Automatic annotation (TrEMBL), chains A, B, C, D:
Keywords: Nucleotide-binding, Oxidoreductase. This is DeHydrogenases, Short chain. GO terms for molecular function: nucleotide binding; oxidoreductase activity. NADPH binds at residues 11, 13-14, 16, 36-37, 40, 64-65, 91, 93, 162, 191, 193-194. InterPro entries: NAD(P)-bd_dom_sf, Sc_DH/Rdtase_CS, SDR_fam. Gene3D superfamilies: NAD(P)-binding Rossmann-like Domain (3.40.50.720). It comes from Caenorhabditis elegans.
Amino acid sequence: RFSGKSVIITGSSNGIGRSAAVIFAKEGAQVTITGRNEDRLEETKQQILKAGVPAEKINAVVADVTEASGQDDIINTTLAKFGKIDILVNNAGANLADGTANTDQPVELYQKTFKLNFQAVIEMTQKTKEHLIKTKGEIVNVSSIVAGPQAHSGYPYYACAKAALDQYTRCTAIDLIQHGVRVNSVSPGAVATGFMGAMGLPETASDKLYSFIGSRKECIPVGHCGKPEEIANIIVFLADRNLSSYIIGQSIVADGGSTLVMGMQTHDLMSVLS
Amino acid sequence: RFSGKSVIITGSSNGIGRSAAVIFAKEGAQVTITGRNEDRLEETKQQILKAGVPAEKINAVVADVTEASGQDDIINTTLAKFGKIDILVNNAGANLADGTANTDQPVELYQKTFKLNFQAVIEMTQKTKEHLIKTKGEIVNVSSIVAGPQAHSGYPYYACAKAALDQYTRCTAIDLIQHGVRVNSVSPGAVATGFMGAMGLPETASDKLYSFIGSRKECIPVGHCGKPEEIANIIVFLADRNLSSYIIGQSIVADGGSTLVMGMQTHDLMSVLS
Amino acid sequence: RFSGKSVIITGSSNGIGRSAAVIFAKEGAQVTITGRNEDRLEETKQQILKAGVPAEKINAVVADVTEASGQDDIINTTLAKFGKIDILVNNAGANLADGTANTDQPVELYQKTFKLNFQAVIEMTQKTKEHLIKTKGEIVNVSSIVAGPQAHSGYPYYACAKAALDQYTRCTAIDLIQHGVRVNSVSPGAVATGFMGAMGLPETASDKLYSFIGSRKECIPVGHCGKPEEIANIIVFLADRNLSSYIIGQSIVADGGSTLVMGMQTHDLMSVLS
Amino acid sequence: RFSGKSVIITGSSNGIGRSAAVIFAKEGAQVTITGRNEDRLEETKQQILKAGVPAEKINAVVADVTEASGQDDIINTTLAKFGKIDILVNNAGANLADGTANTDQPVELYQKTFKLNFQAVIEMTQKTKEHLIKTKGEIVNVSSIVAGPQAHSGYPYYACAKAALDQYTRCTAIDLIQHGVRVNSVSPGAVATGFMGAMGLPETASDKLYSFIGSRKECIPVGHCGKPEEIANIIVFLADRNLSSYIIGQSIVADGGSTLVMGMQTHDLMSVLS
Ligand SMILES: NC(=O)C1=CN([C@@H]2O[C@H](COP(=O)(O)OP(=O)(O)OC[C@H]3O[C@@H](n4cnc5c(N)ncnc54)[C@H](OP(=O)(O)O)[C@@H]3O)[C@@H](O)[C@H]2O)C=CC1
Ligand SMILES: NC(=O)C1=CN([C@@H]2O[C@H](COP(=O)(O)OP(=O)(O)OC[C@H]3O[C@@H](n4cnc5c(N)ncnc54)[C@H](OP(=O)(O)O)[C@@H]3O)[C@@H](O)[C@H]2O)C=CC1
Ligand SMILES: NC(=O)C1=CN([C@@H]2O[C@H](COP(=O)(O)OP(=O)(O)OC[C@H]3O[C@@H](n4cnc5c(N)ncnc54)[C@H](OP(=O)(O)O)[C@@H]3O)[C@@H](O)[C@H]2O)C=CC1
Ligand SMILES: NC(=O)C1=CN([C@@H]2O[C@H](COP(=O)(O)OP(=O)(O)OC[C@H]3O[C@@H](n4cnc5c(N)ncnc54)[C@H](OP(=O)(O)O)[C@@H]3O)[C@@H](O)[C@H]2O)C=CC1
Ligand SMILES: CN1[C@@H]2CC[C@H]1CC(=O)C2
Ligand SMILES: CN1[C@@H]2CC[C@H]1CC(=O)C2
Ligand SMILES: CN1[C@@H]2CC[C@H]1CC(=O)C2
Ligand SMILES: CN1[C@@H]2CC[C@H]1CC(=O)C2
């Protein structure tokens, strides 16, 4: 339970952020849900309400997490309404696509990619710090296996932003634990959300993709494509001092086993000898 | 909840294994607790009973996990009494000490060390496999930060056994997930248990040690020495398909942040310039 | 030998870059040395000339690696004077300081730190590619143990920039190898150079700091503080396709063993028991 | 040069060891080559003689590295003929096969796999130490990408033995460096040698297998299967204190980029959408 806890979940107007928000709410938390898409943000709110959570325990904020005023709005409204902040979930993120790929992607794409997936995390962390230390709270960042240890050459900026995020999780974890706040992270593998849709893929195509990798053991050993709730459960676990108190500055990989398979292992000996 | 689940926790006559066993039991599991020390095994049983768990839901077995007959006894009695096996927790382990240290420790110490911390894990895994696949169960191994990434030159065999364990967790996870069983692990940092006592340290000395590292931020950033329950909570989380289903073949580090600190970082710039 | 090889070493006006430059030159390579400080760049040129290398083999360029103008001059002058580019070593880097520390360092320091330690690498890589694939050349990046696996909470942006670099090395390595160009990196530990001076420390304080860590085994196990040449040697090995041809997208750690020591290991058992 | 250097290369009767042996010899070192197969050991000696090296510089010893008798002969003959030992390269190793696979391989295969790939290293290290600290020598271990970070479920014991080796390299490196001896390692990926033959594959099948993976970029990004010399080169670099002096307790990965590819990346987006 997170009864009474004030929780801020960035990027909760869809996917992982949404699931996490409903879980926190079902666990008795006062949650600040936010995003840019007003319709989807409303959908998240309705799912929480449908869960039997009173409207006063929900603070929906329409904002761009990369904008200073948007960040301030998210934080100020949660403070005004809940009077404190216990947990910060830096979940908002995306693999920004402009049509280019590989090392040829423009630096402008690099700037925007880092602006969202990294700089915004720094800013939310800095602006939330003082409040988290007054409650001896938590921070849970949402990284990705795209950070490594394998190469993700098709989209280096997104991959490197996450890699930067991981070391930021470790740095802020060791610095902030001094003041009583724990910092950890989750590195998801493939998760069927609106992620590919945001990259430009029609629902029909994103579905085909998630379905394909979810059925190929060399893609996802576990036998199914990740679901938002599966990642949300681990974000919640890491946000629960009572259960994960001894875990500090770590990002637990949740990829159904994807990173445990090499490209060379997709061929079996026999078939190669034929 | 683990209502009805059949759980085998090796090394549950003390420390982490004990805590995990009581948690599983409190969660409604039928637990097989085992060890070599009859008195301590009984103490674990009593703690479970004191928790309000009926005696029929407890299978206490006195055995040496490195002995074939001991392993068989553990497995057979749990099958006879519970009729199935859902979770295997390879927790039994120890840093065997014979008075020597560093690369000079004898190979005989290496053989015994691996016999317990590694070979016994292989054997329990092989003998439990078929039953775990009939229930599409779980395996949770208990490794250690002594496996790396830092060197632990004072006791190379214990350190290397754990390192071997980690790759075994990954290997068996990818091989066994094909048949529906998930395999993960936990790599604890310092935990105040009977661990140092088993190495030859009197309770008074082990207490002084755990107390010292628990109060030095450069030793354990979190501000306290690990408690068995803190590691147990994560073993339980990993044993819960419903919550950690997408985590496969991973060992989550729980060391209060110890491995995040370098030896060179124990000196601050100013004091060095003085 | 690098006879018939055109090499560009950014940040070769001092420290590691300087050493790398003199070795490449001694091995018969046409070398382009660069930096912002003309006095020190001249000193580098001087050491190369003293090594018996003819002036027509050395192309000194004053430039700011973060400015497009500087980048273009570095590349164009080499192409104009040497007609091609075989090796590019992204050595330029620094832990920018503004007096602030920890998670409190301003985003402005972040932006400047990344522009130098990461964006400059992206840009030099993008602008040199074409010529490197022309000669089936090499790329050697210089990172730092500051990227991980330990936390470096005092200067997060410098740490995270290096963490991003490492994933960039991997991404470009896998992307550019299909065009015949190898990408690798070296992650140095502490090395007595002008690094600390650039941070604001007078030579006396710098020498003191370096001497101290070089004499404490819990700081640098190898027994001495690293010297520029020790890192230059491995940069040269990685730049020599004839010798390291099978190493791809890797960053070899050269820290005299620093990352192999935990902060907790700085205290021996007996000291604690008293 | 290794002029005035006495070098022991276990497993130098074939593959990587053979290549390493010829290079060391070409660099003017007194070399001790060893193996069990006298025919192949002779072939190694022959290549060294053909390289212009005098017979008094080469000490061929027939021995089983897993037997104390063999270990003592390897060491004593070198000391008797060359008077000292400067470098020890633990190259001997093999993925022992008995027809079984996966987590089902018997503990008996485990014991044999570890005795060769791990215990033999412990023993050679313990028995050579004294002489290595006498000359402030080097130790280079040969591991494998088989240790991780990916799973290698088909042959767990060989994989785990290498994982144990890596932590042993780190432990002994930090322990032996205080006595002036450097310990490092190289983790090769696929390399066309007699490795597959030892596993039971006829030369034709072996050549086919090696050619296949060397031509598929998702298998070996670099474009070719590794050759013994490519690994020997890095072993020699690590054995050359004059060049790698600052590298301690590290195992550089030389797999032509294999570990940088995920099984999921073997499928491109467009192929999936159709
Ligand atoms: N899906 C996958 O396979 C993986 C996802 N991840 C991580 O998960 C997160 C994304 O969620 P899913 O993963 O659920 O993605 P979508 O389901 O892609 O969710 C994106 C979320 O973040 C928000 N967001 C994106 N950019 C901005 C912005 N500039 N300002 C405010 N909000 C923004 C979206 O808001 P709305 O659209 O209004 O803007 C939305 O709530 C990222 O941190 C991502 O890296 C990591 C690994 C794999
Ligand atoms: N304590 C710490 O700081 C850390 C502990 N760990 C891991 O935790 C586990 C040990 O528990 P704690 O950690 O709680 O240790 P103790 O509290 O040391 O518990 C040891 C447990 O394992 C059992 N055990 C040991 N050897 C054998 C054997 N041959 N046959 C049967 N049972 C055996 C003991 O049985 P009884 O004594 O009868 O025999 C007991 O239940 C190991 O896996 C260890 O590596 C990992 C990192 C840190
Ligand atoms: N020293 C250490 O302990 C470690 C160093 N490293 C890496 O080594 C590199 C730094 O070299 P040393 O290590 O030799 O450092 P200094 O000896 O600090 O050398 C810095 C070098 O880079 C150049 N440089 C810095 N900023 C710029 C800029 N904006 N434009 C052009 N050139 C610039 C300097 O040129 P001049 O000042 O004219 O501009 C100089 O040649 C970095 O990549 C750093 O991260 C990694 C780990 C440890
Ligand atoms: N080939 C590959 O793709 C990879 C190889 N490696 C490592 O390379 C080494 C093997 O060499 P290649 O790689 O050249 O293999 P083979 O070409 O397989 O060479 C095996 C070598 O070790 C010796 N050897 C094996 N078992 C014993 C024993 N019991 N006693 C004495 N010598 C023994 C052989 O001697 P002879 O048979 O007389 O006994 C021979 O010189 C191992 O350490 C292996 O793990 C790591 C990764 C990949
Ligand atoms: C890197 N890439 C990200 C997350 C896993 C993988 C597949 C996908 O669909 C999006
Ligand atoms: C390696 N060593 C093990 C576990 C953490 C560290 C301290 C201790 O007391 C026992
Ligand atoms: C790697 N090395 C460490 C931390 C940053 C850099 C400079 C120094 O003096 C100590
Ligand atoms: C590293 N390399 C991989 C797996 C084991 C070894 C032999 C081979 O042919 C492929």
